[PDB]
Symmetry: D2
Subunit: 334 residues, 4 copies
């Protein structure tokens, strides 16, 4: 229903396009990338991780045709030259990873767009929203350049919000055993992060994460109470968060799990999910929720230190949340 555009047709760009296909409220009408329509059609149809797209994918001239609907293809590397206004696009998904500072992503608004959602942590964005945690603090008048946050922050927040509401977190650390991404190297090559410079499918690669910090942007009362690290491992997709927190109240594994299960059926249905099954990561590939509690891994020590473990498909769940935010923003009118 609401016209949308995707700048940067990559892992997240193509996955948002795939998710958009089932949302009614929105309609992706144009996409921009650095490649031709034929490459774009191929990468869109066949995916190593997500499989063959189930739709009629074709190319007419330099315009994609998916299930009969024509999508316009651009190759304008400079975001102010896209002309979103010429084609009616109201929402633009910024997923190139290059325009995360508000002044750059703002170029889309220059080009005619009304709202810009950045699929990554940002700088000086008008607002940071994690669906299920603070979409409500959104104002159509004041927020135009919204950050959807990171995939890691999307997994953690929802169940950090419950844990906090319920038992209260005094402090905690998280580690995300995360699959590799396109920001890494196939074989030892230059990278600013000397660890990410190393062969991705060959080692456990410790790296930084600002996801633990970022959650304070959506859960202010958790400011200065969390921190953590990341460990990129040799799987192509699906990651897991392992949170160890000291709470204010005294609990047991059973009360902690009952709490998460309740939210998963209540307020966070669709965002937070609860699994009591002993699954592995390849089983979460295709998961649309942002966070699935591995109930079997919950642990308590001294009645005050919990260990919660959550799964998340960094591409599918996050892409879906981009679609959700898009459609939510659109419903608040613009």
């Amino acid at each position: 229903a609401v016209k949308v555009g995707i700048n940067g047709f990559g892992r997240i760009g193509r996955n948002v396009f795939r998710a958009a296909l089932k949302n009614p409220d929105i309609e992706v009408v144009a996409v921009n990338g650095l490649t031709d329509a034929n490459t774009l059609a191929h990468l869109l149809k066949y995916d190593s991780v997500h499989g063959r797209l189930d739709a009629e994918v074709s190319v007419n001239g330099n315009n994609l045709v998916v299930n009969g609907k024509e999508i316009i293809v651009k190759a304008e590397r400079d975001p102010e030259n896209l002309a979103w206004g010429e084609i009616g696009v109201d929402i633009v998904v910024e997923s190139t990873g290059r325009f995360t500072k508000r002044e750059d992503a703002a170029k889309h608004l220059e080009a005619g767009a009304k709202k810009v959602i950045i699929s990554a942590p940002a700088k000086n964005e008008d607002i940071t929203i994690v669906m299920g945690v603070n979409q409500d603090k959104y104002d159509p008048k004041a927020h135009h350049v919204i950050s959807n946050a990171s995939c890691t922050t999307n997994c953690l927040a929802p169940f950090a919000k419950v844990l906090h509401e319920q038992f209260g977190i005094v402090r905690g650390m998280m580690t995300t055993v995360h699959s590799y991404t396109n920001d890494q190297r196939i074989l030892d090559a230059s990278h600013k992060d000397l660890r990410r410079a190393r062969a991705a499918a060959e080692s456990i690669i410790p790296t930084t994460t600002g996801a633990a910090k970022a959650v304070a942007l959506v859960l202010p009362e958790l400011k200065g109470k969390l921190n953590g690290m990341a460990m990129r491992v040799p799987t192509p997709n699906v990651s897991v968060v392992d949170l160890v927190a000291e709470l204010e109240k005294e609990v047991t594994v059973e009360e902690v799990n009952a709490a998460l299960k309740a939210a998963a059926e209540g307020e966070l249905k669709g965002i937070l999910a609860y699994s009591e099954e002993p699954l592995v990561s390849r089983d979460y590939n295709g998961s649309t929720v942002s966070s699935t509690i591995d109930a079997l891994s919950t642990m308590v020590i001294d009645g005050k230190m919990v260990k919660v473990v959550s799964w998340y498909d960094n591409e599918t769940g996050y892409s879906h949340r981009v679609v959700d935010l898009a459609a939510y923003i659109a419903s608040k009118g613009l």
Copy 2:
């Protein structure tokens, strides 16, 4: 000079042999497996994880000849029929993974060996030892079936000791991101643990570990103070411990790091290591220590919550421990 017999020439047994060649104090004279000498020489000679053995390996009759010395090869399924006496083996390394209970491991004693080291956590053993932490508590008169704990416990124990001795650990949670081992499956197949039943090279597989609780055997005062889990990921060797604990005292990163570094250069030299280089797991493949602190990852929240990260080559570090334990026992006079 002390004759060593190895039962179960697999990953730990072969590596223990490899490590044994570097130490003259002991002499491996016998090895028991369930294949021919020819299959053993090849598997000993070519290692996918560690590379070719630097030494002459040959097959004479059905005994191995490594650097001219002939090693007796046995094919006794039943430990009771090994006759370690007939050939003078003094210490036996029990590395089959099948005889971790006193009932079975003791069969080696009844068969003529004086001491047995189980290269894994055991049941009803005379004593559980982690070198550098409590070997001093070994009693040559009272202890015959010795357990050398697990590779995880060996990693965490030596630094847990430091943090505790000098700071005080109220409570802690751990996660070891572990390479996969031969107890897993290449493709989905039957397994007691439905998690380790899944294709090892394809997923991040959460599983259990008694390592955390096993620290209490070697460090009695940390009984019931720490607990944890594991996450098997797609790498062939090298693992890492992630400990998150609450100290008695309020420290800083530098504070913690100073203590671990000091310990490694003095107290726990050769056992505990300290690294300030941003390395990846592959870099630790071949490392002989038990624990190398990834100093760039030490982290503190509030001054009370610490996160320390430590690398350990699960096969090489551990096997050099088995060799050091076997040399220490023998020094107490068999």
Copy 3:
């Protein structure tokens, strides 16, 4: 209609089941393994390669329930004690990998079955059949212990048949760059084959194959004309046969490609397929045909030496042909 029993609920055993679920002409009524119904149930439901089973899988005591249907779960490691005769089973799929010699597979007949399908190259079988190539030679009154050959032979026989009737093969050699299977080791371990004893997910492993001479069994015209090898590589599923051959006739890539495409659209429809898309292995995961020609890879040198590349999902394509042979055999009287 026909009632089926599966002996060895392995990768092939469970994928044959998944395939059968869709077919009304057959009916899986019981499975045997070396584990409990709860383990089999979980393995049948979550697959690391093919994903979750879209059906209702549950347990009823010791029995499996799948979509309202009850499947008998046994755990008899000796075919002699299977009693298929008692439960009404007509066709038994022998997919353990341990009973491929008539002397062992015929036990199923003695146990009351009417036909046995060996899911691998057999010894002293009654007939080896490659659907599409020679199921026509199947005699219902004479053949009862049937071999469905190997996944590689099922890939190769279809197009070698076509090229041979079309231009006639004079001699050729093939290599199957194959995915690793459960017959290999995770990390270096004992194996009847020292190539296969090496860490599977770590190297390109040359190994032997009987698939190319086995072809002679279904197309005797090609006896002593073909030969070949295999190289197991680090992918969990999907393989590709590489055939280079000397032709009786001089041809063009374009002629060779036209023959193959015609056979796929006509005679060999559903077994031999043809593609002109620039695809990779992950793309053929789920494929039901036995052999898919990668036309872009087709080459010709001197108009006499050709090269033909074909894909095959070693688990799915092969699992579907077992079901196909099951229904064919059935229809011919049982």
Copy 4:
């Protein structure tokens, strides 16, 4: 003795460096990249595939100090601004993959160098040399910009030369099951070759090669009698060539294998090795030789068709021939 400069400090540039350290005739005095000295020295020091370099590496100013010798680090994205002449560099190793047209490679000569070796196949290069095959055609007067060929052409040419010399090649096809390289993609991303645009570690990926045809640039008699393709698999290093040739004379495996053994221990020692061991890829990681015949894989059909399989560590063997060629050039006069 002869001062060398390396341009492009990548997998091939750093490996040539490791090689060069161990060669008395050459001396790398300078390297040019596109990143800071510290990033370069960490990449040189730790290698995920080859290990920790045994030599003291440090960064004195913007220069690298290796084993006491200071190496000049430049960061000129443009060849002619390199001033190789000022610092007295005679031979420049071109390993960026960007200056393969003799016109671009000539810019080094513009900048003061006397000779340029392109570590890849070139366009309009002066002479293409494969060590052991045609280094004798090098003319110190006529040749300035020289191509060392590709790792694949270096594996194929030496045994093709032997086969055609002893038996005579009527024609043949080849396939190099090759490891992935930096020109590939981590996860599905834009690429000129749609096969290479796919996740490198996840699939078997069929691609094209110039190798088989490029053989004629070293062995002209073989012009037109060869062609092949490539298949990159999920291994980080070490490749294998699989040639099936229709020979002129009727031979036996023993005869094909005897001729190869002779040359390996005679005329081509150092370049062609011969193995009768059942080895796998990981075993050739670090081989300096250009081609090792897997004697066990040698097979022949109809007395005229043969298949010979050869291993080659694509980074190390090739990096050792560049140094070799460099040293041979130095010997002929600069």
